Enzyme design. Structure first.
Site, PDB file in Angstrom:
ATOM      1  N   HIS A 127       0.733  -1.268   0.000  1.00 17.86           N
ATOM      2  CA  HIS A 127       0.000   0.000   0.000  1.00 17.86           C
ATOM      3  C   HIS A 127       0.768   1.327   0.000  1.00 17.86           C
ATOM      4  CE1 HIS A 127      -4.142  -1.518   0.130  1.00 17.86           C
ATOM      5  NE2 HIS A 127      -3.551  -2.600   0.595  1.00 17.86           N
ATOM      6  N   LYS A 174      -8.455  14.600   4.089  1.00 16.88           N
ATOM      7  CA  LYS A 174      -7.674  13.375   4.161  1.00 16.88           C
ATOM      8  C   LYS A 174      -6.829  13.439   5.419  1.00 16.88           C
ATOM      9  CE  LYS A 174      -5.950  14.810   0.291  1.00 16.88           C
ATOM     10  NZ  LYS A 174      -5.765  13.885  -0.845  1.00 16.88           N
ATOM     11  N   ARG A 175      -6.208  12.317   5.765  1.00 18.74           N
ATOM     12  CA  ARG A 175      -5.385  12.257   6.981  1.00 18.74           C
ATOM     13  C   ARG A 175      -4.240  13.262   6.942  1.00 18.74           C
ATOM     14  NH1 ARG A 175      -2.663   6.621   5.209  1.00 18.74           N
ATOM     15  NH2 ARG A 175      -0.499   7.289   4.898  1.00 18.74           N
ATOM     16  N   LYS A 218       1.080  14.759   2.400  1.00 18.47           N
ATOM     17  CA  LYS A 218      -0.184  15.082   1.737  1.00 18.47           C
ATOM     18  C   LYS A 218      -0.155  16.578   1.415  1.00 18.47           C
ATOM     19  CE  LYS A 218      -2.219  11.182   3.593  1.00 18.47           C
ATOM     20  NZ  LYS A 218      -2.984  10.632   2.434  1.00 18.47           N
ATOM     21  N   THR A 267      -7.544   7.629  -3.013  1.00 16.86           N
ATOM     22  CA  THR A 267      -8.894   7.140  -3.281  1.00 16.86           C
ATOM     23  C   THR A 267      -9.868   8.305  -3.197  1.00 16.86           C
ATOM     24  OG1 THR A 267      -8.881   6.328  -0.961  1.00 16.86           O
ATOM     25  CG2 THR A 267      -8.705   4.665  -2.713  1.00 16.86           C
ATOM     26  N   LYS A 327     -13.198   9.756  -5.728  1.00 16.42           N
ATOM     27  CA  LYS A 327     -14.529  10.094  -5.241  1.00 16.42           C
ATOM     28  C   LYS A 327     -14.893  11.467  -5.768  1.00 16.42           C
ATOM     29  CE  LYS A 327     -13.160   7.555  -1.093  1.00 16.42           C
ATOM     30  NZ  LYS A 327     -12.974   7.722   0.344  1.00 16.42           N
TER      31      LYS A 327
HETATM   32  C1  LIG Z   1     -11.905   7.197   1.012  1.00 17.42           C
HETATM   33  C2  LIG Z   1     -11.421   7.989   2.262  1.00 17.42           C
HETATM   34  C3  LIG Z   1     -10.070   8.198   2.510  1.00 17.42           C
HETATM   35  C4  LIG Z   1      -9.094   8.466   1.309  1.00 17.42           C
HETATM   36  O1  LIG Z   1      -8.455   9.755   1.307  1.00 17.42           O
HETATM   37  P1  LIG Z   1      -7.071   9.805   0.526  1.00 17.42           P
HETATM   38  O2  LIG Z   1      -6.025  10.377   1.269  1.00 17.42           O
HETATM   39  O3  LIG Z   1      -7.550  10.940  -0.401  1.00 17.42           O
HETATM   40  O4  LIG Z   1      -6.876   8.873  -0.611  1.00 17.42           O
HETATM   41  C5  LIG Z   1      -9.675   8.620   3.756  1.00 17.42           C
HETATM   42  N1  LIG Z   1     -10.589   8.937   4.711  1.00 17.42           N
HETATM   43  C6  LIG Z   1     -11.911   8.808   4.441  1.00 17.42           C
HETATM   44  C7  LIG Z   1     -12.865   9.020   5.549  1.00 17.42           C
HETATM   45  C8  LIG Z   1     -12.336   8.349   3.201  1.00 17.42           C
HETATM   46  O5  LIG Z   1     -13.637   8.533   2.774  1.00 17.42           O
HETATM   47  O1  LIG Z   2      -4.393   1.439  -0.981  1.00 19.11           O
HETATM   48  C1  LIG Z   2      -5.320   2.195  -0.202  1.00 19.11           C
HETATM   49  C2  LIG Z   2      -4.604   3.426   0.292  1.00 19.11           C
HETATM   50  C3  LIG Z   2      -3.867   4.222  -0.815  1.00 19.11           C
HETATM   51  O2  LIG Z   2      -4.792   4.666  -1.792  1.00 19.11           O
HETATM   52  C4  LIG Z   2      -3.057   5.338  -0.173  1.00 19.11           C
HETATM   53  O3  LIG Z   2      -2.552   6.180  -1.176  1.00 19.11           O
HETATM   54  C5  LIG Z   2      -1.855   4.736   0.605  1.00 19.11           C
HETATM   55  O4  LIG Z   2      -1.089   5.727   1.277  1.00 19.11           O
HETATM   56  C6  LIG Z   2      -2.378   3.637   1.509  1.00 19.11           C
HETATM   57  C7  LIG Z   2      -1.816   2.992   2.565  1.00 19.11           C
HETATM   58  N1  LIG Z   2      -2.656   2.041   3.001  1.00 19.11           N
HETATM   59  N2  LIG Z   2      -3.815   2.045   2.238  1.00 19.11           N
HETATM   60  N3  LIG Z   2      -3.661   3.052   1.295  1.00 19.11           N
END
Ligand SMILES: *Cc1c(COP(=O)(O)O)cnc(C)c1O
Ligand SMILES: OC[C@@H]1[C@@H](O)[C@H](O)[C@@H](O)c2cn[nH][n+]21
Ligand SMILES: *Cc1c(COP(=O)(O)O)cnc(C)c1O
Ligand SMILES: OC[C@@H]1[C@@H](O)[C@H](O)[C@@H](O)c2cn[nH][n+]21
Lengths: 829, 829
Positions: A364, A555-556, A561, A663, A667
């Site tokens: 990942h 996002k986190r 990021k 991801t 969305k």
């Molecule tokens: C799908 C989702 C993620 C993905 O965020 P990324 O850093 O953009 O890929 C993280 N947190 C929540 C709550 C989500 O809906």
């Molecule tokens: O594969 C799902 C997501 C991916 O989209 C994120 O970019 C990545 O940092 C991570 C780590 N663990 N899961 N993820």
């Protein structure tokens, strides 16, 4: 919206069952039942519909006996489940009419449910989407994980700072899971290995019970209902308590509730490695238990009934497939060897061949600090036999390596599952590779780097193992659920088939020039912007000016990021407004949300900054409408389904090469937002899919970051050669954003100026220019919507159905399907 | 048996609902459902019938607004509940036929249920019987206590010794309770008192949440269903966790599960005082929460709707009645003052008058070590305000005393709620007296001693407070449930009215001379002896010779109950058999059961003796059928319903004046066993009821024990002047019953010989003679059964309906009833 049929008969049966559960199940009465009880009455009423096909689907697997896919993940970001359930069964219009006839509003009832937050972010939500797709694709799949008492902490911002409040999500219970205490399994810890000529005995172990909890996973309108089994920890009432020797009974009763701590809480390390014995215990906990259930179902099939009589595990790989989601359940490799060799007494060679043919590892992230490397002493103590088995795996693996590359001694060192040093550790990632027949990355670019850098050695030894499985997002939840408005207008044109196959979204390219459609795509977007403004107000604060560019980065909170980059940009817009106070600029609302890891000080500070900036900006008379800086509190799946459909600009600014995939981007893409991002992770494939001209790519490409590393990054250079950037750094270090505590952001600045591993300055100029272009396009409503219709129409590839369909055919050895399995109706087995 | 009607329609509806719960509720199917699932399907099906009238009964109270009786007890020995539920609703024959038509055996299904053992013994079971009676008597009563995760430990005898295994009774859940998280209340601990002229503020307190769990309590065929609300402890998700300052979130998540320890386990001190802060916390926990619910329901009645507008608590005592079961919930006195004075701002005098008119204390034992006396420092720390309020209560009380008995200084010392010394303590019993308008004993003799000794001072000050409420046992569970055979033959003669009024049992005196009836009473007894022999065999061991005198002593192992006396007698029968090996003696099986308190070493030893003796006796060729010595493992309510109806001899050998009342005696009496006991507790009233000639009373009377204390007890005297007794003491000290470890019983013997506070030797001779008489009567079958019919016929007085009816009219101020409240049928509120 065609959210199903509101049948006269079905509606009447629903209302009946709704009142029945209210009375008998809740022991309430309409003259005392709160919206919550009303929510529960419905939830249960809907649950009933699940059980029928749930029983029938599982039974279906016993008879047909298809290969089973076990998806092991220590996270399953489920979010709410009533609307999804209602949709996947075709019950949304019947339930709406039903509750309406009762005088209840389904929307308020759905808002009563709480997030089943057994996950931090991307990893877990992926698993959740995958689960839904495997069911929609008719796969005999089982999601296995841990049943955390408290998922991820609820975020509270007090004084601009994050506060970790516990997620007591099980308080009012969960009407979806079904405790299965009758199936509680025993997990063993610590101990020693009695070694004889006739075998090896893991003995003198502390026992911990694993109580399963089953949640039904419904596929979209195909009447398939799979299962997610989560393990809950419980102390064994025997060894504990009975030992009057010092135990003192009462103390032992209390100590009983200590082993149960294994499934207590999800570690808030949103992808980060902390060598905690509890985490290791959490991992082994779910691996052993799960693996018992797996072997059990294999033994009670065509083998332990007939076939070769004596359970011959040769066909084990043809019946079982376990997918290691990241290295968390990697213990499944030595554990399967333990069971097969120690308990089942298969020879080592036979077991290994079988093990590797069963397991598949999914990588990942390439970021080093997220890689699991447990200290040898830890494994030696907590799981002695497994460690002995790992050492044997390693010796044979390296024996193969050495034979492939004779004399390549450093290679051996580089490919050793065992890492030497001050503290010897075990590289879990290496284990998974040596023990899986397939390893995959989560995006085209990500998977390539895996073969080019980190696993270049493993790739050279076994080029055949490595693959790519670009992540997906589910169109049911991520479109139909969150955006019933967009799904409607799309449906009015191309019908509802897209829901089960997003590739059909390309047909919307035939409407890029279509006044009606263009106005509709624009109308839904504003409706959504209104609904979110209403939600932010009723639930928290501010009448976010809906007449503005909804720029959002949710996002986190992580340095890679780059929320800080966005902070820089924000301060830039503000400062420019002050320089030219009467020069028109597109009105904007910048929303950033996400949770910082508890011990992640910098992330904590960054959150503090996003709010600190807002304090100033959001109150400057001169700005008074033009620029708003807002931090979205407690960003979770439910908020994601809220904000995204109201998003104009999708901030995806990770340093090239850091975001393995992403991801959230997909969305935003599915929901009608334009993306501003780097050529990172899936951004690359998204822009390729829609054509780089319908995107806002910028900054350094992976090759540029590396060339910069080659000569070294010196942020001072950018500070000296960029006067607007220089200005912001001074407003920080002086206390413009922290008057009361001028020294407040000194560590943020210090990092930026002297220790930025993510080259923020090196992408500031090209970033502000890109944002200028976006504002520019926004100034042309029709043109913005046209580029949007171009984004939505090419989202098709980013469906998890496509991803899963690839995992099925390319790794699992199963052919997905889309045929509607039958419903029980009345018959009871 | 007329266990109800097996209606054709009802039977069909039952089977339908049974299959529905199996499918939807259990998510099982007949081709995979175990007896356990089958048990749960029924339990739920039956539960449905409860809910209707449950809702209707509670609603009934809102409208009518009758005075409410709150029965506060830290124990509620409920036992199973499906059969009782089935009986109290008239569902036993319908359910039997229903499951039969399904091919399931109701008896095996009932055996699946586990004991809701939230109690140690007599105290809790009394509360349980009381609950059932208050419902049968149509009283608006609410049972309040704690919801222990684990009730009382399960007993396992390994090598003749007791082993404390935990009672994980909630493992498969409990289909009777209904969690009510929406009604979770806040309890406060520790803190300090901010004192102002305008009031007192208990502040800086640690919060603990109290989650209620409601269990329905059905009255016998009167369609009344009351409620037992048990408090479960839960940490507040806010103060905990959010405090990032050192809390570290994760640790705080784990520490969250530390305050929840309050309702973790029942303290195994079967009536014994251990000044543990946890126990005090358990007591306060249920007092505060309960008292909140009480004040709440008072405020939402005719007052907080209309009446004097501003909540005037004058009528509080006319609407509320809280019964303090023992001194455990005594904190209700100062707590009610706290709420009324601090929160409600009533003047002290007003509050006290109100408090005393509301509370009533029930004394359960005169034995000193069972009396609660908490160290002042404990209360000062854990509950500062309450301690301040206790000091004020005391000062005013003593001010009254001094004024009643001017100059009586020692009296003041004797009547002080505060005890001086090395560690100042607070006498909880004194609190309850000064704070209640009524105090009662549990038996005629018990209540007299209370006025004559222990509370002689309090009695002299307030003679009007003291009363007697001779304990009861419920005829539904204790006869109809456990002995459907006896209930049948009695019913064939006098009809089923007795169940609701046991005084009708006197009519059986008209059958003392009746061949048929005499043979029937004898036939059921043997049937029961067979069923228990079958149970002992299938569940544990030994084919107890059913052709023998079933001599049984089942109760908590205590030096004052005198299992040791029985041990002496047992060894006596054995030794005599050896002296005259060919002299006929009535064949006997002596069964003793009960659990020893974990830290009660002597009790542990005694258990070890009862088994040690059996090892010898039970294997001597010479005896080989004539004498069996057996210890009944894990004596609990379900075993009680098992053994008792198969009992011939009811051992009730407590030292005169020790057993405050007893309840096991009454059960044995109701079930057709002859009693051999001292003139103690309720034995006295039982023999008076049936005439001392139909009983086997013996030993010293209270007056004799005292005269012996007066001159001092010297067991050596009895040892020197009783050669058969002397022989047993030597067989012990030599190792006849402990060959491998001859020194084993040295402490038992030492106590017996030098420190017997219960004068065992001083009752040995008269005891063996009494047993000779019993064997003698047994030799005359017809004569034994005739004396039995004389016992059963005069059991009427020992019904809890009679007891409760007295509490209602004499203490509570409510007139019990027996009119069948209506059933909901179909209508939903
Ligand atoms: C799908 C989702 C993620 C993905 O965020 P990324 O850093 O953009 O890929 C993280 N947190 C929540 C709550 C989500 O809906
Ligand atoms: O594969 C799902 C997501 C991916 O989209 C994120 O970019 C990545 O940092 C991570 C780590 N663990 N899961 N993820
Ligand atoms: C009713 C009961 C008691 C009472 O026994 P005593 O000592 O005889 O009065 C104790 N334990 C159980 C399980 C009971 O059934
Ligand atoms: O009152 C119920 C029983 C009583 O019958 C016992 O004799 C007495 O020892 C006791 C203590 N607590 N509860 N009890």
């Amino acid at each position: 919206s065609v959210r199903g049929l509101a049948g006269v008969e079905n509606v009447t049966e629903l209302k009946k069952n709704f009142n029945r559960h209210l009375h008998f199940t809740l022991v309430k009465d309409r003259n005392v039942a709160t919206p919550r009880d009303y929510y529960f009455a419905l939830a249960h009423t809907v649950r009933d519909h699940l059980v029928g096909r749930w029983i029938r689907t599982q039974q279906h697997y016993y008879e047909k006996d298809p290969k089973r896919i076990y998806y092991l993940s220590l996270e399953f970001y489920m979010g709410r489940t009533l609307q999804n359930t209602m949709v996947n069964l075709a019950l949304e219009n019947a339930c709406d009419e039903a509750t309406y006839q009762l005088g209840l509003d389904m929307e308020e009832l759905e808002e009563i449910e709480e997030d089943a937050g057994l996950g931090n972010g991307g990893l877990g939500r992926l698993a959740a989407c995958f689960l839904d797709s495997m069911a929609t694709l008719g796969l005999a799949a089982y999601g296995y994980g841990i049943r955390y008492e408290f998922g991820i902490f609820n975020q509270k911002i007090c004084g601009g700072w994050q506060m970790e409040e516990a997620d007591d999500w099980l308080r009012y219970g969960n009407p979806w899971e079904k405790a299965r205490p009758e199936f509680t399994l025993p997990v063993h810890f610590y101990g020693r290995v009695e070694h004889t000529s006739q075998g090896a005995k893991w003995v003198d172990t502390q026992v911990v019970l694993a109580m399963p909890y089953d949640t039904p996973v419904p596929g979209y309108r195909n009447n398939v209902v799979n299962t997610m089994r989560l393990w809950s920890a419980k102390a064994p009432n025997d060894f504990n308590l009975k030992d009057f020797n010092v135990g003192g009974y009462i103390q032992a009763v209390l100590d009983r509730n200590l082993a149960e701590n294994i499934s207590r809480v999800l570690y808030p390390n949103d992808n980060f490695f902390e060598g905690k014995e509890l985490r290791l215990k959490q991992e082994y906990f779910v691996v052993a238990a799960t693996l018992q259930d797996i072997i059990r179902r294999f033994k009670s099939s065509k083998f332990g009934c007939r076939d070769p009589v004596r359970t011959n595990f040769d066909a084990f790989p043809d019946k079982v497939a376990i997918q290691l989601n990241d290295t968390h359940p990697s213990l499944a490799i030595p554990e399967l060897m333990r069971v097969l060799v120690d308990l089942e007494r298969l020879d080592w060679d036979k077991a290994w061949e079988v093990t590797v043919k069963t397991c598949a590892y999914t990588n990942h992230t390439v970021l080093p600090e997220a890689l699991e490397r447990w200290p040898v002493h830890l494994l030696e103590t907590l799981l002695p036999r497994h460690l002995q088995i790992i050492y044997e795996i390693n010796q044979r693996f390296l024996n193969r390596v050495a034979a492939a590359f004779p004399g390549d001694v450093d290679r051996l060192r580089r490919m050793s599952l065992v890492e030497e040093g001050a503290v010897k550790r075990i590289n879990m990632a290496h284990l998974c590779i040596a023990g899986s027949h397939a390893v995959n990355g989560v995006a085209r670019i990500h998977s390539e780097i895996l073969k080019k850098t980190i696993f270049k050695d493993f790739y050279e030894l076994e080029p055949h193992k490595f693959q790519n499985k670009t992540n997906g997002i589910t169109p049911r939840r991520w479109l139909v659920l969150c955006n019933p408005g967009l799904a409607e207008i799309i449906a009015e044109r191309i019908g509802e088939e897209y829901i089960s196959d997003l590739d059909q979204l390309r047909k919307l390219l035939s409407y890029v020039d279509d006044e009606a459609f263009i106005r509709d795509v624009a109308k839904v977007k504003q409706e959504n912007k209104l609904k979110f403004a209403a939600y932010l107000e009723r639930e928290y604060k501010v009448h976010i000016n809906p007449n503005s560019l909804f720029d959002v980065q949710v996002k986190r909170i992580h340095e890679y990021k780059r929320q800080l980059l966005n902070c820089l940009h924000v301060i830039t817009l503000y400062n420019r407004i002050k320089k030219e106070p009467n020069k028109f600029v597109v009105p904007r609302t910048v929303m950033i949300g996400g949770k910082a890891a508890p011990g992640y000080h910098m992330a904590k500070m960054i959150i503090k900054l996003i709010t600190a900036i807002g304090d100033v900006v959001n109150h400057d008379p001169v700005v008074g409408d033009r620029l708003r800086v807002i931090f979205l509190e407690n960003y979770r799946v439910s908020l994601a389904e809220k904000v995204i459909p109201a998003a104009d600009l999708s901030e995806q600014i990770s340093t090239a090469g850091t975001e393995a995939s992403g991801t959230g981007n997909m969305k935003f893409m599915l929901n009608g937002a334009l993306t501003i991002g780097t050529m990172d992770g899936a951004n690359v494939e998204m822009a390729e899919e829609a054509g780089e001209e319908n995107f806002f790519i910028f900054g350094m490409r992976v090759e540029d970051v590396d060339r910069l590393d080659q000569r070294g990054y010196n942020a001072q250079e950018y500070y000296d050669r960029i006067p607007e950037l220089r200005q912001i750094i001074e407003q920080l270090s002086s206390g413009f954003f922290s008057p009361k505590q001028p020294d407040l952001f000194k560590d943020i600045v210090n990092m930026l100026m002297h220790h930025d591993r993510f080259k923020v300055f090196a992408d500031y100029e090209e970033y502000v220019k890109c944002q200028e272009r976006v504002s520019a396009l926004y100034k042309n409503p029709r043109e913005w919507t046209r580029m949007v219709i171009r984004n939505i129409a090419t989202s098709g590839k980013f469906s998890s159905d496509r991803t899963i369909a690839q995992y099925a055919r390319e790794i699992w050895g199963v052919e997905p399907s889309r045929q509607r399995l039958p419903a029980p109706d009345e018959k009871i087995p």
